[PDB]
Structures are given as C-alpha cells and as structure tokens.
Amino acid sequence: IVGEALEYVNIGLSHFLALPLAQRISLIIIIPFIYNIVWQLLYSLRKDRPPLVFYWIPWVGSAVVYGMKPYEFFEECQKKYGDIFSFVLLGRVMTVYLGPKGHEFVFNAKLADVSAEAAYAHLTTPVFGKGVIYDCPNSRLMEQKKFVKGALTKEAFKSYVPLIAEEVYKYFRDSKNFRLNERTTGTIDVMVTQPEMTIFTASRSLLGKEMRAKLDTDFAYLYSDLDKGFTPINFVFPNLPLEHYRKRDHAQKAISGTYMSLIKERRKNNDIQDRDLIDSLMKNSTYKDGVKMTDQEIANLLIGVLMGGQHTSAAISAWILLHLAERPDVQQELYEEQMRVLDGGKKELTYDLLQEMPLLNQTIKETLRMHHPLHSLFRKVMKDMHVPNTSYVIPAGYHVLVSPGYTHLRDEYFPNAHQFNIHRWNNDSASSYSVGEEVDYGFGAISKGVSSPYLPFGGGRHRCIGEHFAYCQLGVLMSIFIRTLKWHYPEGKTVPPPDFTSMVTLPTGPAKIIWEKRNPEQKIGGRH
C-alpha cells in the first residue's frame, strides 16, 4: 500500500487550505524563502553554470549591495569566484564577466546571442518615443547611428567649436552661478552648473539656434521633466500611474512636437542647410530598404541623441572640475598649454588647435578612466552561450553585465588606479584608437577587438558614436574654464565619492568649488 500515502497528500493539502490566516501568511513567506535557499544550494552543484552569489531575500537578490556599491560588490565577488559569476537582481539573473575577456564576451557577442534592446527598451522608449534606438530592430539602430554620425564629422566639429565657446562665455556672463562682469569670485555646485552648460552647448550645436533659443524660456523645464523619467526606478517599474511618469510622457510629446514643428517649418520654406543635426536628418534619414524615418521618429531620435550626451558629458565635466580643484599644479600645467597653443590667448580656439592640446585631452581621458559614467552595461541573453575555456553555459533568459569602468580602476592595468594622473596618458592622448583591425556594423569602421582594458565608449555594434563630439564639447569647455578661472575647494572639502544609484556615476552632492577670475577686470561682451 502506497495509495494510503496518496490519500494523506490530499488530506494534507486539505488541512493546508484550512490553516489559520496567521499561519498561512507566515507560510506564504517562509516557503519561498526556504525553497530559495534550497534552490541556490542545488544550483551550486551545476558545473555548466558560473557561481551564483548567495542571497537571503527572494526576488530582490543582491540588489541593495549592487545598487549602492557596484564596484565593491564586483571586487568581493571577483576575490571569491574569479571573473565570471552571476547574481540575482530584482527578478533577473545577471552574469558578470569582469576584465578584458569580459569585454570581448559581451561587446563582441553575436547579434543572435544577445539583445541590447531587450535590456534597455522598457526604460528608453517612454523617454525617447516610438520607432527609434531600442524600439526597433538592430538594423534600424545601426542605420540611425549612421544618420547621426553624418552630422558628427570634422567639418561639423570645426563649426561647432565657436558655437560651443560662445555658449560657455554667455553662461559665464549671464548665469547666476557666475556673472563674471559683476563678480570676481564665487561658489558653485558643479552638479548645478554642468548639466546646464551641457544642455546649452549641445542644444546650440546639435539642435540649432532655434532650439537653443527655446531654452531661455519655461520650455526648458520640459527637459527636466523628461529627465525624471530616466531613472533606475523605471528599470523595474517602467509604468506606474504616478505624476512624474506622466510629466515624462507629456514632456516627450511637447519636446518632440517642438522638434517636428521646426522640421515641418524648414521643409515648408525649403530652408534645409547644413547647420545642425536636424538639417542632417532631414536630408539623410532613409533606410536601406527605402523606408524613410517619419518626422516623429526624427524628433524621437534627436531626443535620444541629446539625452545620450547629456548625463555622460555633464558628469565628466563635473568630475574634471572636482579633480582639478585639489590639483592647482594640473591647472597651472593646463594653463601653460593654453598659452603656448593659443599664443597668450591671441589665437581664437579652433577644432584643429584643440588637437594640439594633449594635456587637456589627457585630462578628459583620465577623468573618463576614473569616472566612467555607466558602471554596468547590459544585454539580455537570447540563445545559450558557452563561455570560452570554461564549462559554463549562460542560458537564454539570463542577462550579461559588462563593466569596463571596473577594469579602469584595477591596478593590474592602470598602476595606482585611484590616483588621478593625466601624465599616465603621455604619448597616448587620443580619445581611443583601433589598435589594429576594424569592422563595420552599419555606422562606420570601428575597432574589431574590444579587449582594451580602457573602454569608456564601449565597443562592438553598440559602440558610442558621440565620442568625438564629447571630446570637442569637453575640450572647448575646459579650455575656457582654464583660461578664465582658477578654482579650489572650500576649507576641508575634497573630491566627493561617486553616487552609483542614479543613471550615471555622479559626484555625491553638493559638490562645491570656489572659483575666481584669472583676470578680475576682464569683461565678456554681448548683450544681457
């Protein structure tokens, strides 16, 4: 008789359902908890899986320690498990592959194996709009990047430089944070000034004068509203009926409506030049199967592009100011380079002269090493992946995480990695360089290997295309800061630690510096 056991199964299930409610809820908690611990122990027996970081709370996983201190998390995990390990994160299993072989595994993964859009779309599509970036197939994305790269040529940068410079000078002249014609010293929060300087400079050069003019009005607040939908909370809860979710949606419609108004206006008057990225996309937005981008998709793409440059660049110029505030030796060395390359300030800044300022560009390069703004990049695994030279298979449904910014801070590859030293890039001041062979995924030839330990712009098919614009924007900005101001910390303040909980690895605020005019009597012209 084992039927008698089957009877007591049914009886036991019957008594379960009749349990007092305090015992039921108590069982609703402890049973997943116990089963979770039981499941991790069994999982650790598989030799075709990377080790899984142990965790107590089901579903939540290591979310708290990963979210607050991801590089300390990766360091402890690397010590216990080596370079490949998994961890549970708010319902998803993330497989991390640290170091240059990790860069190869994730950035050069076959298009069939992994998907960036399946990882990112739920966050970006409500902010940018439909049909662009991650709300479309990869081949569309490749061509959208090709279209945008067409306003990111050397000739475009040659004309952007005086525009960016003018925006910087107007901001020194007009912003409450400076007012250089009335004040010779002052205190600023770089997390206030740098997001504003970034949007002004990128709008004026990428979007044009009209969109720049609209930033002088209350329209400028729509970018802040749009910004607030770009939070890690939208990573797990992409649609909650709360108020900031609808200010995001409203801002996306109002901003893209403004871009579309300008677009349809320029087509109506045949006023399509080579001024800005709007002109460029109006003349160059037809895919290779004949389909043209709609005016809505062009506007959504312009949002994406500005947004992709907004927080990365603002973060980096904040960190450059913060590192230089305790390094008056570096400020003095950069000042001397400015005086030699620009003939005591007599020469006007041009894109070509920016290329003759190695120490300035090394400063950007070194800030991008220490403060990579995206600590983790993600893909969702679409087919089972064997990791080379191991027995591991990463099953479809997992995510892979790569973190070049973690490698940037490893002493093995950058001696004394937590020291800020622009001279470690002596003789190698280029934003990056294909160290050999190349490959074209649709938006131009880029490095084929991605094993460099230094990868601030990623690699492979999802590689950044804003790198030269970022260097051009940061280079003009810092050139002018250095020629105009010295700055330092208030007594007892130093370089703040990064805040890893936001989209980018921002300084913990308020990160304040004190500035003073190098030439207290110098006046910025124009009208205000």
383: amino acid identity, one letter: K
Helix ranges (H only) for 129-183 are 138-149, 154-174
Binding marks (x or -) toward ligand HEM, 315..344, rule CB under 6 A?
Answer: -x----------------------------
Q: Under rule CB under 6 A, which residues in 461-520 are in contact with ligand HEM?
A: 462, 464-466, 469-470
What's the rounded Cα separation, in Å, for the pair 2 and 7? 9
Closer Cβ to ligand HEM, 277 or 334, answer by number: 277
Would you say 55 is a known binding-site residue? no
130: amino acid identity, one letter: K
The only residue of 86, 95, 201, 312 in contact with ligand HEM, by rule CB under 6 A: 312
Q: Helices H, strands E: what count in the chain?
A: 20, 14
Closer Cβ to ligand HEM, 146 or 248, answer by number: 146
Would you say 264 is a known binding-site residue? no
Closest CA to 515 of 195, 194, 163, 202: 194
Return the range that interacts with ligand HEM (CB under 6 A); candidates 40-48, 189-197, 367-375, 495-503: 367-375
Minimum CB separation from ligand HEM for residue 139, in Å?
Answer: 12
Cβ 215 vs Cβ 203: under 8 Å: yes
Identify the residue whose tokens are 């081949």.
Answer: 139
Element housing 79 (H / E): helix 70-81
What's the rounded Cα separation, in Å, for the pair 141 and 116? 11
Closer Cβ to ligand HEM, 186 or 460, answer by number: 460
Q: Is 116 in the site for ligand HEM (CB under 6 A)?
A: yes
Would you say 462 is a known binding-site residue? yes
Closer Cβ to ligand HEM, 180 or 302, answer by number: 302
The only residue of 129, 186, 373, 507 in contact with ligand HEM, by rule CB under 6 A: 373
Max Cα separation, the chain?
102
Q: How many Cα neighbours within 13 Å face the side chain of 22?
A: 0
Count of residues binding ligand HEM (CB under 6 A)? Answer: 22
The only residue of 308, 449, 475, 498 in contact with ligand HEM, by rule CB under 6 A: 308
Minimum CB separation from ligand HEM for residue 410, in Å?
Answer: 17
Closer Cβ to ligand HEM, 55 or 425, answer by number: 425
Give the residue at shortest CB distance from ligand HEM.
Answer: 466
DSSP 188-215: EEHHHHHHHHHHHHHIIIII-HHHHHGG
Return the range that interacts with ligand HEM (CB under 6 A); candidates 47-55, 65-73, 169-177, 453-461: 453-461
Return the range that interacts with ligand HEM (CB under 6 A); candidates 257-265, 306-314, 384-392, 432-440: 306-314
Q: Is 311 in the site for ligand HEM (CB under 6 A)?
A: no
What's the rounded Cα separation, in Å, for the pair 428 and 139? 34
Binding marks (x or -) toward ligand HEM, 254..293, rule CB under 6 A?
Answer: ----------------------------------------
What's the rounded Cα separation, in Å, for the pair 141 and 460? 13
What's the rounded Cα separation, in Å, for the pair 242 and 320? 36
The only residue of 205, 313, 363, 484 in contact with ligand HEM, by rule CB under 6 A: 313
Residues with Cβ < 8 Å from 219, sequence gap 6 or more? 254, 258
Closer Cβ to ligand HEM, 140 or 247, answer by number: 140
The only residue of 195, 208, 229, 309 in contact with ligand HEM, by rule CB under 6 A: 309
Minimum CB separation from ligand HEM for residue 156, in Å?
Answer: 11
What's the rounded Cα separation, in Å, for the pair 170 and 45? 63
Structure tokens at 514: 């004190």
Structure tokens at 161: 């430089």
CA distances from 77 to 62, 343, 408, 438 (A): 11, 52, 17, 34
Closer Cβ to ligand HEM, 55 or 500, answer by number: 500
Would you say 464 is a known binding-site residue? yes
Closer Cβ to ligand HEM, 67 or 442, answer by number: 442
Would you say 134 is a known binding-site residue? yes
Q: Is 457 in the site for ligand HEM (CB under 6 A)?
A: yes
Beta bridge partners of 486: 516
What's the rounded Cα separation, in Å, for the pair 287 and 350? 34
What's the rounded Cα separation, in Å, for the pair 285 and 272? 14
Would you say 379 is a known binding-site residue? yes
What's the rounded Cα separation, in Å, for the pair 256 and 128? 9
Structure tokens at 408: 């940037």
Binding site per annotation, positions for heme b: 120, 134, 145, 379, 462, 464
Binding site per annotation, positions: 120, 134, 145, 379, 462, 464
For ligand HEM, the binding residues (CB under 6 A) are 116, 141, 145, 305, 308-309, 312-313, 316, 368, 373-374, 377, 456-458, 462, 464-466, 469-470
Binding site per annotation, positions for heme: 464
